[PDB]
Amino acid sequence: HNPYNFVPALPRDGITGDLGDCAPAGHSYYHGDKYSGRIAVKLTTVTPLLIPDASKEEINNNHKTYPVRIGKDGKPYLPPTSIKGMLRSAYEAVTNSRLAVFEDHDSRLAYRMP
């Protein structure tokens, strides 16, 4: 198997509901009908996890070596932004949302002609 694939992003004309496009609920108050609060999540790694510290990247012969990023206690610092992007892309898949990061795709692509 190829190590990547694609969940199809379906067109969203006539999507009419919470999965549709909508004005956001806002931040001003907790709406009586909408849920707020804290979810506690246990994350456990199944395969090894890479958390590169680019701030400490050793470079020799233009080859970069990354240590694990660690917090003030010396345990691995898994960044919340890394979890957020994992969660967002998975969320955006299963809700068939907009593509949040779709950058620089307005030129035609090039290949060897016959």
Add this chain to the structure above:
RNA sequence: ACUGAAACUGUAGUAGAACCAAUCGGGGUCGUCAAUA
């Protein structure tokens, strides 16, 4: 055909109230490349 004198423009009053320098973003990842003869 004799200069008036003497008298503090001072006294009281806070350049201040309000406003989050902030919103979104996994330090990530795979197919060639080159154009003649």
